[PDB]
Design a protein around this ligand. Structure first.
Ligand SMILES: CCCCCCCCCCCCCCCCCC(=O)OC[C@H](COP(=O)([O-])OCC(O)COP(=O)([O-])OC[C@@H](COC(=O)CCCCCCCCCCCCCCCCC)OC(=O)CCCCCCCCCCCCCCCCC)OC(=O)CCCCCCCCCCCCCCCCC
Ligand SMILES: CCCCCCCCCCCCCCCCCC(=O)OC[C@H](COP(=O)([O-])OCC[N+](C)(C)C)OC(=O)CCCCCCCCCCCCCCCCC
Ligand SMILES: CCCCCCCCCCCCCCCCCC(=O)OC[C@H](COP(=O)([O-])OCC[N+](C)(C)C)OC(=O)CCCCCCCCCCCCCCCCC
Ligand SMILES: CCCCCCCCCCCCCCCCCC(=O)OC[C@H](COP(=O)([O-])OCC[N+](C)(C)C)OC(=O)CCCCCCCCCCCCCCCCC
Ligand SMILES: CCCCCCCCCCCCCCCCCC(=O)OC[C@H](COP(=O)(O)OCCN)OC(=O)CCCCCCCCCCCCCCCCC
Ligand SMILES: CCCCCCCCCCCCCCCCCC(=O)OC[C@H](COP(=O)(O)OCCN)OC(=O)CCCCCCCCCCCCCCCCC
Ligand SMILES: CCCCCCCCCCCCCCCCCC(=O)OC[C@H](COP(=O)(O)OCCN)OC(=O)CCCCCCCCCCCCCCCCC
Ligand SMILES: CCCCCCCCCCCCCCCCCC(=O)OC[C@H](COP(=O)(O)OCCN)OC(=O)CCCCCCCCCCCCCCCCC
Ligand SMILES: CCCCCCCCCCCCCCCCCC(=O)OC[C@H](COP(=O)(O)OCCN)OC(=O)CCCCCCCCCCCCCCCCC
Ligand SMILES: CCCCCCCCCCC1=C(C)C(=O)C(OC)=C(OC)C1=O
Lengths: 96, 114, 105, 70, 347, 98, 110, 80, 312, 169
């Protein structure tokens, strides 16, 4: 009985994983536009904040290489409210 | 070092697929069969360029090809689809195995009309 | 004494856990996979004495990926200037940095 | 006789029936007449937070179907 | 102890040291030290008296503290390098902590304070293991981390070990403490030439292990643990007095013997690096070690101390002890200086 | 670097100086030693979970097990001390001064 | 967050019940009790066997800690190696138990 | 081998059942025909994304669409 | 709203523990050819209320405690761990749905021996300390087979998720592939809670506590008894779950857990006590070798049958 | 306040070590190390290490500190200025560190440390249908062969060594 039912459960797992795989291109495109939205917002607010500070380059990469670096949590949700911060940074860990 | 170059906010504007995760998972296998080509163009671009800023326009094609997937559901089979993603939507883990007759009606209606 | 028994006998006793750029289960990348791959491919074969001065850029990139000290220092500067301009009333946050804009996807 | 132990077993069984029935009705009431979303994995949390953003009412459980696309 | 269990425990000691020698990951280095300590604890408590239990307690505390500082150095290396290769260390704090941890494992001064205690508390065979085999694994890690070892730290540990192990044995009448302070002085000699030429470190380690194994094997053959009991040897076994004579004249670095070989080569690799004060002070401080070696040879070989009457009984029983490799080690620890350029096999 | 690493390192040094300054007991010494091991567990764990280096997630478990076995060894050593003097006092362990 | 609230609620209920148990019958003004055991005043004799069963627990619990990732380890692609190492860990736990047996370690608490 | 086995089953049946169950657990995966299917199911479970290949011009066995005939098939998993 | 759910968990736990004492005295009465309590309430239903009011106004026993702090903390820890063992229990939905509820319960039950140990040392009696050391050694002994049997059963589940353990048993009860693990599990959980025939605390540690705190230890012990019966029910006798009607699962697992708690009550009125070495012999020389052998069998068995359960 | 919660737990963690590094009594030392293990477990849980934190409960606290309190309760027969002085010393050192790093957003005792909350250093992606920590621990049997061999051999030798050194013969 456990043989038949765990084989059926493996087939159902593969079906759910292929549903996920069929959804991953759209979720990847939305994720890319999401993080580029947030970085552009942080960039424009840095340009309108860091005007007084002498010698500041707005949007300057701390890395030497010009390769894309995955944005850190503080890079994206830095200038936002603490509610959005906590929802993004401990939401899944604290969820039930 | 140098200045990172981000795209403008006009470059990120696109008609968002504003449907829920159960609507996505219920329509998932037909989305993976029918919206194959620009999705795989996009994900090949995404693993080869390793930079999302170089992958935006292809992603727009994804966000173009997804919506034509759903309008073509909405023009022909909105009612069995709605009955199917409601039953998918009830479950906490969103089981396919709880929802086989609604899947059967939706697959029958899509195989007939589309 | 480094009796390299693993390279002599061709066995892989502990090289897999050595670096983050190695073969991970289910192809999970580390958060600094590209930086460590670039530092290793720079510093390979040339020795440590040459590698400390000829791969300094890749190693500074990889260390600053790991610890994020320049990133957090930049965030400290941005947030502290923002707090000073809030305290002086010279600046207001936008609506999209207050939670009233119905986020993207 | 032996059915004299049954009032105490009935009281104890109602007292064990209360927590599961109560958490089931609370999970239906707090989640729009449905089950609580099990997010054990970060993909499930990604979808659930995407639901929270696409509903527009800051709630994951308020679902949006074909009426939300044109 | 069950001899099968003794064989398995000694193979586990050797296994932990080999796991330190052959591994490229830091966790396996730490695992080799943990396995080595965990297996050597019953070798110290073999005879089951409170001195062995006290010695095992002191050894456990020092080696546990060193293992914790080692794992902290490894964790800081993973902080500042993101990886686990047993190679140079990418932080001077992790380099300092690992050099401290290995100095505590070797018993280098001022972490020497457990070596004359524990060697006194344990039998001669377990002290032989502690002073010969237990020096192999930390010197292997010091061999592999030397591009990041701070110079002033390792030289301070080296001269402090040489001076304190020199002034230790002058007050000692117990032979195991004499071998312990000799161990501290020779480990200072090994780590002083470390950053200049680690081949001479390996040469000093091999010659020291040969000479120490010769002296402990003579001590086990004659069943003597004090100077005054070693002085009874001429009336029982007159050849053993000649053997402890030539081996203790070897351990002081007197030419034409082989124990002159390492320290001379150490000076030969330190005057190349324009250090003249430091090998001179080290060589002059080694005269203290040679002085208490000469004290032991005066008590044993060059004079005849009075024995007792019961020694006449022991004239009628030959030595049934398995004096393993004692002619081989006695020859190698004395007559090897004409083969001084053999050291290139350690390169 | 990150701010929690400050507290985990300072906890390691607090338990270090507790393990490096005995009062009377050997059990309190072993408690400080296992506090050092616990802080190493937390610190290695926060690094490995930080950097998403997947294969080292089995690393702190190993760091637990060996060292917990090490603790067992020390406890047995303490018991042998307490099978001689009646207490686990470190001032009774001075037979090897001469 | 729900879990931290639940733990705080359970600790608060337990502390409230313990406070009621330690302070409600203190208000009884009953009587002062004048001059409030098989061994009289002898010291506690150390039992070697209790310490032995505790350390045997600790070591076998460490072997359990090695065994705990097995429901996740059955999902691997290198199943021959996984099966060999799983049977080797349970076999080394059994060898630890057999050595604990045959050298009279499980005695008078068998 | 026969009287000894009945003797240890008479005196210590818990240990006989222990060594019998452990011996079956050792030897029986090497003799089972279904051990291969465990491997084939665990490698067919798609945890990651099947990152597609650039069609250079000569890949006759790689499909262009998931519903194409060429490629890996799991009809053995459905049927068994 | 979640606080209401926590209250509707923890208050009915206390009520079911209160009336489990009545069910114990009644079931032990009728199994002993007599009656249980039937005078104080109608069919005895007011006996636990009368007894709780009796104990909370009895004189405090007023001991000379070695440590005041641990004398306070041992009932606090016992009650807190007795209540937090319920929050991952799926019935059919837990209060705290977590990915590692099984391992959470094994951890919070491993922490339960500190209450016994602190109550034993916080009393000035050396006899109470010897009894506490015996009870702690007994409990940590049987936690070994708890962990290994539980691991061997969860090799058919795929995860440490307790909610997945209902999905695992939708075609068969898991006692049918794992009844030897079930019977050793059942006796081992009988030996966890110091329950007869493993109750050497009643055969000739918290005897210095007053009637209030001793009642709190007693109710924490019966909360552990009800909880381990519910956990054994979910673990081996998994009920049918219809997601649109969860009360079917709730009525079903409640009936099974009541039968299993009555089975504890039915064991304690049937057997004499073990001697201390006899249950040590039962663990280390009977349960643990079969537990290791069945652990090897349940490692190698989903591989040889191609029945490896899903990870998710 | 809630964005600093791991930091706050870590402060309790440091306080917990001063709860036993001052060494009041080995039973109060055991209690302090239990509370320290609980809060350090919570720190592990808040980066997503659920299995490692439950190892801190099941093996460190419920496995090993049980044995420490057990062995300690078989000694120190049941019934300071330096203890309380060292305790308040370590507490004031730690709160001076807190005050410095919260008024400067930067501190340097031995290393440089940021003063913002440690939520900033996290990752912004998902791991799919697996915990990366759970799969890296599951990798102990496929990729971790030599590690399992040496760990199981060290535990077997640990059983043998404990039986040798406690026999007295
Ligand atoms: C290369 C690395 C070699 C490392 C050393 C290996 C051996 C020593 C370690 C193990 C040990 O103690 O063995 C006992 C040990 C004897 O030491 P002992 O306890 O002092 O015994 C003294 C008398 O043998 C007591 O006499 P007996 O009556 O008890 O028995 C007579 C015995 C009978 O022997 C036998 O029966 C052995 C033959 C059978 C062996 C097994 C075959 C299967 O004769 C001998 O063994 C004669 C002595 C042989 C020389 C020993 C030293 C060997 C060389 C060590 C390194 C030298 C390096 C110099 C470099 C200088 C420049 C730097 O060795 C042997 O018995 C075997 C020697 C084989 C030598 C082979 C060399 C080439 C190898 C390739
Ligand atoms: C005692 C030894 C028992 C285990 C023997 C090896 C079992 C095994 O399958 O090893 C393969 C495993 C792993 O090989 P593998 O087959 O998994 O390799 C495929 C590659 N990876 C791991 C990336 C999937 O180990 C080795 O190959 C080397 C390590 C062990 C070598 C033997 C050590 C013996 C020590 C004796 C002292
Ligand atoms: C929730 C679970 C159950 C909780 C506990 C049960 C619920 C009821 C709690 C209150 C019961 C009444 C108070 C405690 C019992 C007092 C009995 C007693 O000894 O009384 C004599 C005592 C003392 O009377 P006394 O002064 O005559 O002293 C008798 C002793 N001699 C003479 C030797 C000195 O009375 C009290 O302590 C009165 C306390 C207040 C009573 C209640 C006031 C109203 C509260 C509403
Ligand atoms: C979950 C629902 C409930 C589950 C069932 C439990 C309900 C029944 C409870 C009854 C009351 C129990 C009161 C406490 C009793 C404690 C004493 C006791 O029973 O000790 C256990 C006794 C102890 O042994 P003993 O003391 O009776 O015997 C003497 C033992 N020596 C010689 C060592 C002194 O037995 C066991 O340990 C058995 C444990 C379970 C065995 C499971 C075996 C399954 C079959 C395997 C295969 C066999 C065939 C061979 C291979 C074939 C391959 C194809
Ligand atoms: C770059 C370097 C890499 C590494 C190179 C190699 C390093 C070698 C290190 C050698 C360390 C030797 C440690 C001691 C030997 C190990 C086995 C042992 O314990 O032997 C002692 C044993 C105990 O017998 P027991 O019953 O306890 O006796 C008590 C008295 N009744 O039996 C006895 O007591 C019998 C008495 C005689 C024993 C003599 C043993 C001599 C062993 C050393 C030989 C020399 C080293 C090898 C050659 C040089 C290599 C550098
Ligand atoms: C210099 C390096 C350490 C810096 C921190 C110092 C903290 C304050 C303690 C100073 C020493 C006080 C003292 O008297 O220590 C002795 C005591 C053991 O001596 P004992 O015999 O128990 O008491 C009689 C006193 N001779 O020793 C102890 O009890 C020492 C306990 C040390 C625990 C350290 C706690 C944290 C301290 C801050 C972080 C470092
Ligand atoms: C190879 C397979 C895997 C093997 C390793 C895994 C084992 C899993 C189970 C764990 C066992 C751990 C404990 C083992 C202890 C063995 C030693 C032992 O118990 O010897 C004593 C015993 C007699 O008991 P006694 O000492 O008198 O006890 C006092 C109470 N009367 O003596 C005996 O009862 C005799 C015991 C030895 C003979 C047992 C034979 C069983 C054969 C079953 C059928 C074949 C199964 C295939 C494997 C055979 C392996 C030999
Ligand atoms: C989830 C469900 C949990 C259920 C838990 C409880 C189960 C049992 C429920 C109670 C069952 C009935 C109990 C009846 C008790 C006896 C009452 C009685 O007859 O008392 C008589 C007494 C004297 O009255 P008197 O006027 O003198 O009579 C002379 C007549 N010529 O007068 C008095 O004593 C005064 C009146 C006292 C009334 C007390 C009633 C019992 C209260 C128990 C607490 C629980 C309440 C129910 C909770 C669940 C339902 C909401
Ligand atoms: C002597 C002092 C007083 C003694 C009495 C009171 C203390 C003892 C009794 C209480 C013990 C408390 C145990 C707290 C942690 C338990 C482990 C845990 O949280 O596991 C559950 C869960 C892991 O499951 P998972 O599904 O992976 O997480 C959700 C994401 N998917 O993980 C989560 O859901 C993580 C949620 C966020 C992090 C929660 C952190 C809680 C606070 C820190 C620990 C609190 C206890 C400290 C003292 C312990 C003393 C033993
Ligand atoms: C306020 C909530 C209830 C508090 C606890 C008191 C009631 C439950 C325990 C009382 C008890 C009962 C009924 C009981 O029957 C009994 O004997 C077996 C005890 O002593 C061992 C008890 O302690």
């Amino acid at each position: 009985s456990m043989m038949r039912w765990n084989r059926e459960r493996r087939r159902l797992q593969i079906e759910d994983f292929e549903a996920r795989i069929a959804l991953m291109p759209l979720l990847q495109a939305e994720k890319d536009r999401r993080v580029l939205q947030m970085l552009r917002e942080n960039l424009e607010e840095e340009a309108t904040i860091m005007k007084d500070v002498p010698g500041w380059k707005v949007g300057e990469s701390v890395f030497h290489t010009t390769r894309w670096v995955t944005p850190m949590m503080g890079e994206l949700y830095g200038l936002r409210t603490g509610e959005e911060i906590l929802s993004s940074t401990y939401g899944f860990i604290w969820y039930t | 070092p140098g200045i990172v170059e981000l795209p403008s906010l006009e470059d990120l504007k696109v008609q968002e697929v504003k449907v829920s995760s159960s609507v996505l998972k219920a329509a998932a296998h037909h989305y993976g069969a029918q919206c194959d080509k620009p999705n795989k163009e996009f994900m090949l671009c995404r693993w080869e360029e390793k930079d999302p800023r170089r992958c935006l326009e292809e992603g727009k094609l994804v966000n173009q090809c997804a919506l034509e997937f759903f309008r073509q559901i909405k023009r022909h089979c909105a009612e069995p689809f709605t009955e199917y993603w409601t039953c998918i939507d009830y479950s906490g883990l969103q089981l396919f195995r709880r929802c086989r007759k609604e899947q059967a009606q939706f697959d029958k209606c899509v195989l007939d009309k589309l | 004494p480094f009796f390299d028994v693993q390279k002599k006998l061709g066995v892989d006793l502990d090289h897999w856990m050595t670096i983050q750029s190695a073969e991970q289960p289910h192809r999970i990348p580390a958060r600094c996979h590209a930086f460590e791959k670039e530092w290793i491919e720079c510093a390979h074969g040339i020795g440590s004495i040459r590698a400390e001065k000829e791969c300094k850029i890749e190693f500074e990139d990889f260390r600053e990926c790991l610890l994020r000290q320049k990133t957090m220092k930049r965030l400290n500067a941005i947030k502290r200037q923002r707090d000073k301009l809030i305290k002086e009333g010279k600046y207001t946050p936008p609506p999209h940095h207050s939670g009233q804009e119905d986020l993207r996807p | 006789m032996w059915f004299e132990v049954l009032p105490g077993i009935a009281v104890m069984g109602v007292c064990l029936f209360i927590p599961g029935m109560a958490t089931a009705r609370i999970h239906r009431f707090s989640n729009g007449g449905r089950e609580k979303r099990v997010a054990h994995y970060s993909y499930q949390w990604y979808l659930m937070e995407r639901d929270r953003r696409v509903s527009g009412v800051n709630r994951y459980y308020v679902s949006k179907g074909l009426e939300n696309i044109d | 102890m069950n001899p099968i269990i003794l064989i398995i425990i000694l193979m586990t000691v050797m296994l932990g040291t080999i796991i330190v020698m052959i591994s490229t990951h830091w966790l396996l280095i730490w695992i080799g030290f943990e396995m080595n300590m965990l297996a050597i604890i019953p070798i110290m408590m073999k005879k089951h008296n409170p001195r062995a239990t006290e010695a095992s307690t002191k050894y456990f505390l020092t080696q546990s503290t060193a293992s914790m500082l080692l794992m902290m150095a490894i964790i800081i290396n993973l902080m500042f390098s993101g990886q686990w290769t047993v190679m140079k260390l990418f932080n001077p704090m992790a380099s300092m902590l690992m050099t401290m941890a290995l100095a505590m494992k070797l018993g280098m001064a001022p972490f020497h304070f457990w070596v004359p205690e524990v060697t006194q508390g344990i039998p001669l065979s377990s002290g032989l293991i502690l002073l010969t085999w237990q020096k192999l694994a930390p010197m292997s890690v010091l061999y592999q981390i030397l591009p990041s070892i701070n110079l002033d730290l390792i030289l301070t540990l080296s001269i402090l070990s040489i001076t304190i192990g020199g002034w230790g044995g002058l007050n000692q009448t117990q032979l195991r403490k004499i071998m312990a302070y000799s161990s501290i002085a020779h480990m200072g000699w090994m780590t002083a030439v470390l950053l200049y030429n680690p081949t001479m470190t390996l040469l000093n380690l091999i010659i020291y292990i040969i000479m120490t194994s010769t002296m402990f094997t003579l001590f086990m053959a004659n069943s003597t643990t004090t100077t005054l009991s070693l002085s009874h040897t001429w009336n029982k076994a007159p050849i053993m007095t000649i053997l402890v004579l030539i081996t203790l004249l070897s351990m002081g670095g007197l030419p034409p013997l082989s124990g002159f070989m390492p320290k001379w080569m150490i000076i030969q690799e330190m005057t190349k690096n324009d250090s003249i004060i430091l090998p001179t002070l080290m060589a002059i401080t080694a005269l203290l070690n040679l002085y208490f070696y000469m004290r032991l040879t005066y008590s044993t070989a060059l004079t005849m101390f009075p024995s007792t009457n019961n020694m006449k009984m022991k004239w009628q029983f030959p030595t049934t002890k398995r004096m393993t490799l004692l002619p081989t080690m006695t020859v190698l620890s004395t007559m090897l200086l004409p083969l001084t350029p053999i050291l290139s096999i350690l390169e | 670097m990150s701010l929690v690493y400050m507290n985990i390192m300072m906890a390691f040094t607090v338990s270090l100086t507790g393990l490096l300054m005995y009062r009377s007991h050997l059990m309190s010494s072993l408690l400080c030693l296992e506090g050092m091991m616990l802080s190493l567990f937390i610190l290695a764990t926060l690094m490995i979970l930080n950097s998403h280096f997947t294969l080292a997630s089995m690393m702190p478990i190993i760091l637990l097990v060996f060292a917990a076995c090490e603790a067992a060894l020390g406890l047995s050593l303490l018991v042998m001390v307490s099978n001689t003097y009646g207490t686990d006092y470190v001032q009774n362990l001075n037979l090897l001064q001469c | 967050m729900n879990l931290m609230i639940t733990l705080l609620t359970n600790f608060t209920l337990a502390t409230l019940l313990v406070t009621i148990a330690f302070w409600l019958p203190q208000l009884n003004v009953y009587s002062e009790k004048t001059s409030p055991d098989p061994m009289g005043s002898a010291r506690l004799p150390f039992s070697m066997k209790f310490f032995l069963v505790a350390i045997t627990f600790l070591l076998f619990d460490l072997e359990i800690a090695l065994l705990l990732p097995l429901p996740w380890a059955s999902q691997t692609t290198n199943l021959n190696t996984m099966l060999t190492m799983a049977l080797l860990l349970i076999f080394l736990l059994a060898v630890s138990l057999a050595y604990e047996w045959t050298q009279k370690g499980l005695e008078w608490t068998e | 081998v026969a009287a000894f086995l009945k003797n240890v089953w008479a005196k210590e049946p818990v240990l006989v059942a222990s060594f019998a169950i452990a011996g079956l657990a050792v030897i029986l995966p090497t003799l089972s025909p279904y051990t291969k299917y465990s491997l084939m199911i665990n490698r067919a479970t798609p945890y990651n994304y099947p990152v597609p290949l650039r069609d250079d011009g000569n890949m006759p066995d790689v499909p262009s669409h998931p519903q194409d005939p060429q490629g890996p098939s799991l009809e053995w998993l459905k049927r068994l | 709203m979640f606080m209401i759910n926590v209250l509707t968990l923890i208050i009915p736990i206390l009520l079911a523990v209160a009336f489990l004492t009545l069910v114990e005295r009644k079931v032990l009465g009728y199994m002993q050819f007599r009656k249980g309590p039937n005078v104080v309430g109608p069919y005895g239903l007011l006996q636990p209320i009368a007894d709780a009011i009796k104990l909370f106004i009895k004189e405090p026993l007023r001991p000379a405690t070695s440590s005041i702090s641990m004398f306070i903390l041992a009932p606090i820890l016992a009650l807190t761990l007795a209540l937090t063992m319920w929050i991952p229990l799926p019935m059919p939905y837990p209060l705290i749905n977590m990915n590692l509820g099984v391992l959470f319960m094994l951890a919070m039950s491993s922490l339960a021996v500190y209450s016994i140990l602190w109550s034993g040392w916080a009393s000035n009696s050396k006899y109470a300390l010897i009894g506490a050391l015996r009870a702690v050694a007994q409990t940590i002994s049987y936690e070994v087979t708890l962990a290994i049997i539980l691991l061997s059963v969860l090799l058919m589940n795929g995860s440490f998720t307790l909610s997945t353990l209902i999905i695992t048993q939708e075609q068969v009860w898991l006692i049918f592939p794992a009844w030897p693990l079930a019977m050793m599990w059942f006796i081992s959980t009988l030996a966890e809670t110091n329950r007869a025939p493993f109750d050497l605390t009643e055969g000739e540690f918290n005897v210095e506590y007053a009637a209030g705190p001793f009642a709190l230890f007693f109710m924490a012990e019966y909360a552990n008894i009800i909880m381990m019966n519910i956990f054994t029910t979910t673990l081996f006798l998994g009920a049918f779950h219809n997601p649109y009607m969860p009360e079917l699962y709730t009525i079903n697992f409640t009936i099974k857990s009541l039968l299993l708690s009555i089975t504890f009550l039915w064991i304690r009125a049937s057997y004499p006590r073990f001697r201390y070495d006899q249950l040590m012999h039962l663990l280390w020389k009977n349960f643990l070798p079969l537990t290791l052998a069945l652990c090897m069998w349940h490692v190698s068995l989903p591989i040889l049958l191609s029945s490896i359960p899903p990870q998710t | 306040m809630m964005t600093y919660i791991v930091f706050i737990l870590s402060i309790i963690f440091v306080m917990g070590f001063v709860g036993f590094s001052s060494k009041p009594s080995p039973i109060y030392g055991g209690l302090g190390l239990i509370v320290s293990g609980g809060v350090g477990c919570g720190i592990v849980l808040n980066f997503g290490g659920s299995f490692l934190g439950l190892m801190v409960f099941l093996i460190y606290l419920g496995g090993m500190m049980v044995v420490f309190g057990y062995t300690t309760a078989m000694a120190t027969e049941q019934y300071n200025k330096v203890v309380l002085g060292t305790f308040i010393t370590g507490l004031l050192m730690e709160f001076l560190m807190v005050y410095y790093v919260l008024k400067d957003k930067e501190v340097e005792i031995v290393f440089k440390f940021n003063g913002m909350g440690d939520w900033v250093i996290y990752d912004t992606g998902d791991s799919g249908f697996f915990s990366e920590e759970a799969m890296g621990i599951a990798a102990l049997y496929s990729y971790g062969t030599w590690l399992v061999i040496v760990t199981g051999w060290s535990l077997l030798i640990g059983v043998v060594v404990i039986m040798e050194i406690t026999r007295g013969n």
